[PDB]
Every structure is written in C-alpha cells, then in structure tokens.
Amino acid sequence: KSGLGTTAIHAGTLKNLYGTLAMPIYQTSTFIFDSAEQGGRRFALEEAGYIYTRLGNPTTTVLENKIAALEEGEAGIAMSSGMGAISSTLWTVLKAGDHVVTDKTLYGCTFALMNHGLTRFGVEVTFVDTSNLEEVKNAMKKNTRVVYLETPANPNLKIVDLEALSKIAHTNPNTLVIVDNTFATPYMQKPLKLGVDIVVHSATKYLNGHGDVIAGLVVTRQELADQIRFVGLKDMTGAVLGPQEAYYIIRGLKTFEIRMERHCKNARTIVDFLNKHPKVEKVYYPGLETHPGYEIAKKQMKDFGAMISFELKGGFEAGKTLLNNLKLCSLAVSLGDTETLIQHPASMTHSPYTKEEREVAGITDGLVRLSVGLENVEDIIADLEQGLEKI
Amino acid sequence: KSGLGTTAIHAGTLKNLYGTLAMPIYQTSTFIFDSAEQGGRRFALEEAGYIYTRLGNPTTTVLENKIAALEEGEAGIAMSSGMGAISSTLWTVLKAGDHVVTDKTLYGCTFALMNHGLTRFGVEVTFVDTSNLEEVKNAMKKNTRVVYLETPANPNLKIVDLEALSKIAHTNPNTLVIVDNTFATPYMQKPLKLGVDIVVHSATKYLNGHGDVIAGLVVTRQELADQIRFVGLKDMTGAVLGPQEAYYIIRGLKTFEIRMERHCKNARTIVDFLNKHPKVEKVYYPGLETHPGYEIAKKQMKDFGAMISFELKGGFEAGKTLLNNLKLCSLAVSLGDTETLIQHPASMTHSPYTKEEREVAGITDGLVRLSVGLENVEDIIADLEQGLEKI
Amino acid sequence: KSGLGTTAIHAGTLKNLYGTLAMPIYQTSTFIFDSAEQGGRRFALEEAGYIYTRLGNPTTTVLENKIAALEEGEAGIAMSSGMGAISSTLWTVLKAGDHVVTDKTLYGCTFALMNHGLTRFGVEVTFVDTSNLEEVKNAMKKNTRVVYLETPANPNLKIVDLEALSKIAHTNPNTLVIVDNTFATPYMQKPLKLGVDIVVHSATKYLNGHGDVIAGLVVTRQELADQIRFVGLKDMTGAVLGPQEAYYIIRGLKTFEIRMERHCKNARTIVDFLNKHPKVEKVYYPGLETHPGYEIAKKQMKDFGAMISFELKGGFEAGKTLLNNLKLCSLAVSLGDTETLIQHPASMTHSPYTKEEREVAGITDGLVRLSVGLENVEDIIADLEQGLEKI
Amino acid sequence: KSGLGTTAIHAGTLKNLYGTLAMPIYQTSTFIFDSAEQGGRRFALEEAGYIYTRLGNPTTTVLENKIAALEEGEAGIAMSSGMGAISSTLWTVLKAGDHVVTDKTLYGCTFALMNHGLTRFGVEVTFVDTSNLEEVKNAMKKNTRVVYLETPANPNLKIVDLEALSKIAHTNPNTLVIVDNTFATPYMQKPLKLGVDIVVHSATKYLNGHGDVIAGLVVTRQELADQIRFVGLKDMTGAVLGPQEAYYIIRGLKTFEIRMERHCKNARTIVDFLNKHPKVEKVYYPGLETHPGYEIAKKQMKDFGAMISFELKGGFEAGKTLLNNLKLCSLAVSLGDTETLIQHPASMTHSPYTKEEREVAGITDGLVRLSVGLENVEDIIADLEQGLEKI
C-alpha cells in the first residue's frame, strides 16, 4: 500500500494526449463527438468518455478519483462548494416524509439547511446530542433515512464515535450514515472504514489548503455516487466545479500530506502554550486528555487536528483586544489555509445576537477559534504571546 | 440611455486599488477584517464589504451587476451552472404544498427537476401547453406559487407570450413568474419589462459565449435576490461560481453585443438557405412567418435568434449521414458558442429511447438542431450544402 | 478559401484525448516520456511531440498555427510580450558588425532597443524616413542585415509602402525585412504577401483584444522560425508565453473578425466627427484623403484602422481638460482593447520632457491619441462631445 | 527574525481594496489613471503606482518582494523563464568589448547563451574550472564585467566556493558576480550573504514547485534591479511573467519551506540507499563526505539538496532498463517538482551525440539524474529497487 503523500500526488491520474506532467485544465463546457453514433453510444452508456462538464470533466475526474483513493472509497464526486456536496447528497437520498437524525452542533449552514430548508420540503429532522448513544438510539424511527454526523465539530471541537453511531443507525436497513470529514481530513480519519456510507468535505478548507477555492467533495459506493451525480448535482443543485478550481485543488493535494503534518505539529505545540497560559482558562482540543471524548478521538483519529478553540478568562473585551493586536494571525472566517486564521465568534460571526442567544448556541464571551497555519511555530506563538500581553 | 455594447462592456464595474483596466480575479475563499469590530459590522449588515466567497465576491459582483443592467432588473446573482440558478431560485421560493404551472417543453434537466425532484419534496406540478392561454388560466390554483416559462424552447423553438402569461399568473397575488431567457438573451428579450418577476440564464450558452464555462445567472428585485442568495445559494445548492469563471464570463460579455449581432445575421441567412433546400422539409425558426407564434415573437423579441431546428425529409439515416459528413460544424451538445454546433437528437441525446418514446417527447427522426456560430456564413453554408449532397 | 472569422475560430487546432470543444490549457512545465528511447527520439528530432514548455507547448502551438494562418505564413512563434517577439527575432538574425535600416517613428521601446541596446552590442543602426524611398536606398549597405518597418506608426499614424521598401531591401541578398503589424493586424494588412520576410505583433493589443495579456507573436518561413524559436526564444530572451495567456489569446481570437469590424466601423464614424469638429484642428487617420500616404494605405490596407490621433487647437491645457472630463473613454496606455482608451502624450507619457524635446520627438502640445473600442459609437461620440465642450 | 516558512507565506504582500486573503490576480495589460496629471506623475516617477504590466504588476510585485525577502536582498524582478532572468540580467550589465569568466559546467542553455549568443555580440567569454581558484584568478582581466557561477551544478553536482570566488572577482572594481541559485534555493544557500552581487533563479523548478509554470527571478540591489527591469526586461528580452503564473508561484511559495524540508529528507535517505546498492558504482551528492567540495558545501549550504546523480555499473543499457521499468518516478526533464523525475542523459537529452562527444561533455553511459520529489520515501525506494533488480 502506497503512503498518503504518494497517493495524494499520484492517485487517480488520467492520461493526456501529449503526456504533460501537470494535469491539463479542460476548461470546456462541451465535448465533441466523432460521429452521431459515438454521441448516441455515450448517451446510452455504451462507450466511455465525456459529454458536458455538468455531467463530468476529465480534470474533475482526476480530483474525484484522488479523494476517493484518500478516503478508501469507491467513487468521488466534486461540487463547487462544501454546501454543494452536502445539499446534492441530501436532495438525492431524501424525500418528503423521510426523517433525519443529527446533532445541534453542526456547521452553521448545514444546521440551517436541516432546520429551515429540508423541513420546508416535508423532511422531519430531530436534533440530538450524538455524543450520547442512548439519545441517538431513542431518536431512530422506521422512516429515518439519514443519520448525519460531524466530528470534530464547532465550537468546542466536540467528538462523537463514528463506528458506534453507524452501528446504531444501521439497525434500520434503510438508514444512510453521512459524515462531514472536513476538519479531520483523510490524513486523520477515514469514516468509510468505520462503517459510514457517505463522506462529505468542504474542499475549501484543508484539501485545497490555499484559501483560493470554494469546493466540495463526496466519497461513497459507486451505486450511490452515480445517483448523487446524475440526480443531486445534475438537476437539483447544479453545483458544478469549475475546471480551473478542480486544477487548483489537485495542485493543493500535491502538498496535502506535508501540509497536514505541519498543521498538526504546529497545533500541538500551540495547544501546550495556550493550555499553560495564565490568561487562557480553557482549551478545546481533541488531543487533550481533559477533552470530552478524548478516548474516542484517540481511537478514530490518527492525529488530533489543527483547529483549537480556547476561552480567555477576561471574556468579551479580552477576545477583541487579543485579535485586534495580532500581526501574523489573520482575522477571517474559514480554516485550513496555509496562513493562520483566527475569529472571536461573540464579536464577529455572532454580532447580531444577544449574550443569552449566543450562550444558547454554545458561544461564550471569551471563546476564540484558531485555525493553525504553516508559519514557523515560534512566530505564531510570539504573535499570540504579545497579543495576550495586551489583555 | 447607453447602448447595449457600452452597457455590456462598462456596466457594474467595481473599483480596485491599483486601477487595473481588467477586472481583477479575486481568486479567494475568505476575506480579512481590520478588526474584530469590522467583522461584527459585516455580519450585522452595518458595513459594506466581503466575508466569504459563497456569500459574494467582488469579481462575481461585477458580473451580477452587469447581467442585472442588461436585463434592466434591480439585482443579479451568479451560480456555477444554469441548473444552479434555476434550482437555487426554486428552492428559495417554494415549499411542500405549493403548486407550479409550467410547460412540457422545458429544457430537459429543468423538466426532470420539476417532474422528479420537486415532486419528491411535496411540490405539485402541472404541465400544460403554455401557448394556450386558456390551459394556463385553467391550471391556476390558490396555492400556485410559480409559473415557470421558457421561450423560445426546444425542440421546435416554441414561442409563448410572456406578457400575457404573466398577467394570467398575477391574478393570484402570491404567484411568481420565472422565465428561462437563455436562448433569447437580453439582446433579444427582456422579460422583466413584460411583467416577469425573475429571469434565469444558463450563462454557459451565449452570455459567456466561448464554450469554456458552466455558469448560471438570476436577475430579479432586490428583496427576492437577497433571499435567493442567502437561502437558495448559501444553504440549499451551494452552487458557487468560481472567480476564474466569473472573470471568463465578464470577459465574454465584452463582445456580447457584436457576437449576438453576428450570430443572428448568420442564422437568418442560414434559415433562408435551409427553408429553400429540397432535402429539408421543414424549418423551425421564430422569424419565419409560417412558425407558430411568429406574431408573438415579433412583439417580444428584437431579433429571432441563432438557434434553428429543421426536419430532413429522409429521416433517421439522413440525420446521421448529414452530421457524419460535416467538417466545420461540430457534433456536440450545448449552444451559444462561437463555433457552430449541431446535434441529431434521435441518434444522439435520445439514443436510449424507442421511436415511439422519442415522438411522444417531440423528437422526430429527421430533426436536426443547429446552434449557429460566428464563422463566415458562406463557410457554414458550404459545409451544410456538401453534407446535404451526401443524403 | 475560408473567411477570416472561420480561420480565426478554427485554424491551427490540435486534437485532445477527450475531444473537449475548448482547447485544453496545458499548464505544465515538462512532459513525460513513455521510455528512455522516446525521450531520445524527441531530442534527436526523430519523433513528434513535446519536451518542455520553453521549447513549445500544445496550447501555444495552436496559437502559433492560428496567427500563421491569419498572416498566410508558414510558421508562428509565441512569446510573453511584443518586445519578446521583436527582441527574440533580432537577437537571432543579427550579430556584431551587422547593420540595420529603420525609421525614427518606431514604437518607443523598439526605438530604445535599436538605439541603445543593439548599438551596445556592436550593431550599427541608421534611422531614416522610410516614407522616402530614396533615403532608404541610400542607407543600404553590404552589411545591412535587417530593414525594420512599422505602418501605421505613432504618433501621427505614418504610412510607409511595405512592398516598395521590401524591393529596395532585397537588392541585398542577405537583408531581411521585418514588419511590426500590430496596429493594422492581419484583418487589414498581410505583409508577407507583399514580400516581407518576418511579421511581428504585440498580441497584447488587438489580437488578444481584451486588455488582460502581455504577449507577442512572430510569423515567418519555417527555416527562420525554427532559428527564432531555438536560439532567440530558447536562450537569448527566454520570453516564454504562459499557457494560460496562450489560452486567453486563442479565446480572444474567436471574436477577432467581428471585433476588428466593429473597431473600424466605430473609428471611421469618430474620424468624421472629429475632423468636422471646430475645436479639433487636425486629424491623423490613414483613411483621410488629406493624410500623407493615403494612396499607399489604400493599396496595402483592407481598412484604415481603429487608431486615431488628433490635434486640439487649444494645445496643452485643452488636452488635459478634454481627458479629465471624459467618463467613458479610459485614460491609459495600450491600445486594441474592447474599451476605448485615450492618452495625451504631452502631459502623460512625455511628462519628463520639455516642450522642445517633445516637439523634436513629434509630440505636439494638443496631440491626443485615441484607441477606439467596441462601445456603441453614439456613446463614444457623446463622451468626446461633452468633453470637448469643456475646452 | 521570522522563520523561512513565515517569510515565504507572508513577506512582500500588498494591500487590496476588498481585503481578500489570497493575493488577487491582476490579469491586466494596462492601468487607468484618474487624470492626465496622474499619468504624467507616474511617468515622471513622482507618484507611486502602475502603468503597464511589462513594467510591473501588483501580483508580480508581491512575488518579487517575496523572493527578495527569501534571499535577503533589496529588490526582486520576475520574468517568464529562468532564461529570461539570466538573459535580461546579462544584456543589461554587459556590452560589446566586455569579458565574462564562467564555468564549462553550467546549465546547458546558459552555456549556449554564453558560448554562441554573447560571443556573436562582441562579448569575450572564458570558460574555466571555477572549483580551481587559481584558474579563476588567472582568467580575470581589466575588462571582466561578469563572473557567472552555478553551484551545485550538473551533471555531477559540482560545488564551487561562492564567497572565495566573489573575493577573487571583486579584485576588479567593475566586476559583478552572478549566481544561478536554482538547485540550492534560498532554503539552502543565500549567495548575497556571501558577497555575490546578483542571484538568478529558474522559478520553474523548486520555487514554484508544482511543474506548471515557466518563470525566472532575479534578486539584487535596488540600483541594479531598476536597470535590469527598465532595460533588460523592458526592451531587450520582453520576458514578461503572466499574472496567472505569478499567482501560481506565490501559491507554490506558501509550501516552500515544508516542500524543501521533505525534498531533502527524502533525498538523504535515497542517497544512502543508492550509495550502498551493489548495482550503483558511484553517487554524486554534495552531502557525501567522498564528494569533491564536500567541505565547501557544508560551509555554504544549510542542507545538501534534493538532486542526486549516480552511475550504474552496467552503463548504457542499464540506464535504459532501469528507467523503462520505473512505475512511480517519471521520465522527464526539469526538476524541483512535487513528483520524482528521472533522466538518463546518454539515451535522452544527449541522444544526438556519440559516446566520445558525450564523455567530453561529462556525460557517462551509466549516469542517471534524479530529482527527488515529495512521495513517501519508502515508495520511491521500492520503485528504484524493483527497477534496479531488472538490470
């Protein structure tokens, strides 16, 4: 078995006519046929090859094959955002009258899709604490079609047991388990090997890694993949990845192994610094023995990630003061970029909401979320240290 | 009022820091804030500027403003395909229990979304002949939320009266009229000026014009646009246009006026050639006085388009023989490219279906669809002429 | 013979493995061999195919073939600027001890290369008035290796007789005639058909047309082309065109015919407006019967171009006042973009120089240079008219 | 002082109007002025900002600043190939009658430029063994304008002492020392800190790192940089980097530190494997204590690189047999890509030449050149091992 760097670099490649080393950018909408009969054979699935980029594209196929190889699944599908991957999947496999079990701690736009979108179209959704196996067992119904999971998950890097939850879900023979593996990536976690049916990613984050593409990826069995491609993507979302962006992500994947290694190395060192810092009252990190679900993280994750959240003891003003004094870390949403990113949800993403509303949503006044980048760790720590001195 | 070329070239531009002549390609996922407070102000809609490309991007904003200016609507939204524009719109404005009135002659993937997708999620859809005003009146119900129209529409370039249909739809105060204006483009037809509520496009076709981008556009009133952006696009499709592709379309729009002029000039000359040709039994073209709805086309279209369909008197084998002998026209799906494209649906797109099934779908054995390109018309005609000689 | 639009759109295409309609972007540095022996055969020129993008690239080859087809020459070479095309050519064909005959009215950077660059490396250069055939005859020497010409040429759109000058040059069997055909383009002028040996272009201007690429092109006989490629480009300039930029230019060429037609249509109408305007004392345009060399322009140009210069009777302050009040025309260097561009050399490009110095260089205080774009001509004229009212 | 990763990621950034995280791609030829007077001020160097991409471009400026920061020099200049960087520099600083001292072991195209190009234009060139300090001292003349060096250099990874050679060169007050630092990169070697005047790179190799760009970079003092920009690049080569390619290289530099670390880690392990392998008679690697100049390499290089050459004891047929059996390593020219590349010069690049001719050029029948990539080292070694078994 080839190593992960070898796989990220080489897996899934397709031939080209000129033997270019780089994967060509097939920046095309349509494809020409040699004859009427060849066109007919492609539409009848009797001959291999391409028709139209919304259906598939050779640049995109390489990307799809690569992510499937990394997750050790049968088939990949690419979309023009993580929400495109998630929605295309859900619109394919659900119908009015179906039921979904999921967590309240889900990526915000996914929560909105679940709570306000799917429910408008006749889907029943129950939100439970998926760290409580009994709650999940009790929420299962005959018409549960999807159990949707995310681990680690915002804002406190909650860990849930994918293998155990999948066994519970699969007591109903019609239930699919879908996992958003964005934060962990296939460098750390391979949900399909734990019995999950479908993996989804925001490739916008670590997989691309360079903060320049919005994209999503799905990995699953061929039978399900073909439905997600030819129903969800083709007709119900149209979230078609641009060939240029497919190329950018392929290119980003050339450094995926070494980026993830450095992200995690940096992060573990920063966790130790923050957890020993007098102005930080608590650190949320899956690799701390004091983190809830540490033992689950240790079983299902090869490393503990490069996201860190932490609570400043000085609360709201401490969060703003820290961030406003940083010179290296960048104030922004998103994660998984080569540059370190940081946000203070109480003053930034959750500015429309009262303290009470924020706290109901798990956002505390001193909570800071850090996406650790690839800078020299001494420089990231020096920046945090000087900022913390100002509180 | 500026002319259409002036508008396509100059409308909607945003400033950049360096005064580059070309619109910069803001190939970014995220945006940095100067302070925590600035981030908060953007999330609270208290300060202008950007957050994250799925929400909006400055390159994409220029494109959005341009198409809104061309359609003479308030607001534009861009997506990563025409189906992204269509689906994002429909998921925003519909809910389970709503009803839709539309035509059986709709773009195939839209038909599939209507007939198999929306119906799975509790939406009622009635397909009528929207060229028959009484049929449309009779299909209206209290819960009709959308009347969805397309003109000219495949495979016989059917014309329907947008102004008249919109008046019928608007007898219900909750009904929105949505028009797919892809074929006509704002060079020929501006549905919002006829009382339509929302215009959608596959920018993959004429607007981009260069056969290298999959993209969609929506134009509507600001109130509706903001919902389509922040609900449909943000959460329910994630069909986020890549900044590179946004740039390609802006670039394509620099020649939109002159491309459409040449497309139509070429097409009218080719229509005359085909309609007088002994091996062609019938031509479908909105500008022929013998075309059904010619008088409606004359009222609502400034020119009659660059799509032509025609029936070869020799049927199925004549279609294949013609196409297999062409040297300039390219055998492919799609339309609106600078290169002339041609397809024979009976042997190509509809190869999975029996003659009976095809004929029920309006596909006759000798039907050929031609997307007239920008080549010198003498060369396009010479190619068709030599191909027709082989039948 | 195919028309110019057909040729621009279709000529020079290469196959690709997937039959994409758009030319793939082979964004690669290097190319892989199937075997050691295949690599050897390519290096020994025994097998066709690619090695490394500085030598050649399939995307770039299409562009090269297209410009060669448009100029009706044997071979094309692409570079990363017009100055790259010019310098690569000159470094290939010259040596210390050679002589060059050229005009003082040459593109400024070419003049600098001739007067200050080549002369530093042992090349003798004589600058004459190439509109005076006797001056050119008298400048010829046994060691004259290049006669370098440009028509129309800045700042007064000087016309020189390419066929006549080439006959004079070719009285020496070792002399090559090189023409910068940027302004005229192959839509108007095909110097190789008049006996010229090498044509050079700044593709930055009309050929790309979209103000987003810096690039150069050369067309000549295969024997000379191979030397320019494998000596000048390979080793002496390294002015290697990026595959992305090659694609942009191919894409720009899809509309070359219709762009040039509209550029010239607009320009002729604007010339009439300016030449009849009371505040304009003189117009420089090859198509005016009062222009020097009008009859030569009529013989060697199919149309008279889209560059216009004109003298405002109010001089220096009138130039600045006009330009500072324009709202549609953009203040910028360059030409041949879809947007109308304008400059006042006395206050802009020639700001470092005294009135005396400027006038020696042919720059008069009221001289304005206009690159007519593709906007609706009524809008361009309205903008100029309101600006002229302010003088 | 910030670490090298921090510097590569963050140095040299310019602001943009929207605070995009990624550097915008200013894919423009020209720049617009607010007024005639602003244009004049820019041409008179009285106001900062841009004019035209051949002169400079904001995307490219970021790249230039980054490489200058990495080399710890004052100013950077970018070109569209390494040969563009080299030639632009040489044409700027030389003139007919000048003399150059350099090595016979120079990159092949540079050797050709020196031996056949510059000599055609009146420059005297002496080729010496620059590992012999006395030879270099003896070659110095009053008119020596350039001492041009390269270390490590093909085909045996020759090492020369940059500090010592620079002292010899600088005994003539008019002599500039130019070093091609491509192989070593600023991760290993910073020639300006050793007294060198100008550093040149093929950014095509490690700096970009992703095998998808042809580009060059120069770093030197501001006074020299401005001459190379405004003479060499502007007029004498026109080797203008495309903004897209500038962006690709900036993007590549985000992972420069971690890529170089893994390249070298992999390479050192492969050197040990090859040097102990019974079918390999000799390994050329700067870090072997048996390599000539090992002690010089240890003084001027922080690590010993990721290029390896080696001699197979079985000669010509062994080279071909090895390469023809490899499944992971790719047969190609170039180096510094994320993928491992390999070549056998005797059968590939030097296929036109006899054994005698090859051996005079230092190419021996069993010589193999390996550019070690970023794949898992166990996989690279397994591939080499199985290939070596076939000899």
Curated annotation (Swiss-Prot), chains A, B, C, D:
Keywords: Lyase, Pyridoxal phosphate. It comes from the Bacteria. Substrate binds at residues 107, 369. It holds the Pfam family Cys_Met_Meta_PP. Its cofactor is pyridoxal 5'-phosphate. Pyridoxal 5'-phosphate binds at residues 52-54, 82-83, 202-204. It is an enzyme of class 4 (lyase). Its EC number is 4.4.1.11, 4.4.1.2, 4.4.1.28. The modification N6-(pyridoxal phosphate)lysine is found at residue 205. GO terms for molecular function: carbon-sulfur lyase activity; homocysteine desulfhydrase activity; L-cysteine desulfhydrase activity; methionine gamma-lyase activity; pyridoxal phosphate binding. One of its GO terms (cellular component) is cytoplasm. Gene3D superfamilies: Aspartate Aminotransferase, domain 1 (3.90.1150.10), Type I PLP-dependent aspartate aminotransferase-like (Major domain) (3.40.640.10). One of its GO terms (biological process) is transsulfuration. It catalyses: L-methionine + H2O = methanethiol + 2-oxobutanoate + NH4(+); L-homocysteine + H2O = 2-oxobutanoate + hydrogen sulfide + NH4(+) + H(+); L-cysteine + H2O = hydrogen sulfide + pyruvate + NH4(+) + H(+). Catalyzes the alpha,gamma-elimination of L-methionine to produce methanethiol, 2-oxobutanoate and ammonia, and that of L-homocysteine. Can also use L-cysteine as substrate, catalyzing its alpha,beta-elimination; this activity seems to only minimally contribute to the production of hydrogen sulfide (H2S) by F.nucleatum in the oral cavity, which is toxic for a large variety of cells in periodontal regions. Belongs to the trans-sulfuration enzymes family. L-methionine gamma-lyase subfamily. NCBIfam families: met_gam_lyase (TIGR01328), PRK06234.1 (NF004876). Homotetramer. This is L-methionine gamma-lyase. It comes from Fusobacterium nucleatum subsp. nucleatum (strain ATCC 25586 / DSM 15643 / BCRC 10681 / CIP 101130 / JCM 8532 / KCTC 2640 / LMG 13131 / VPI 4355).
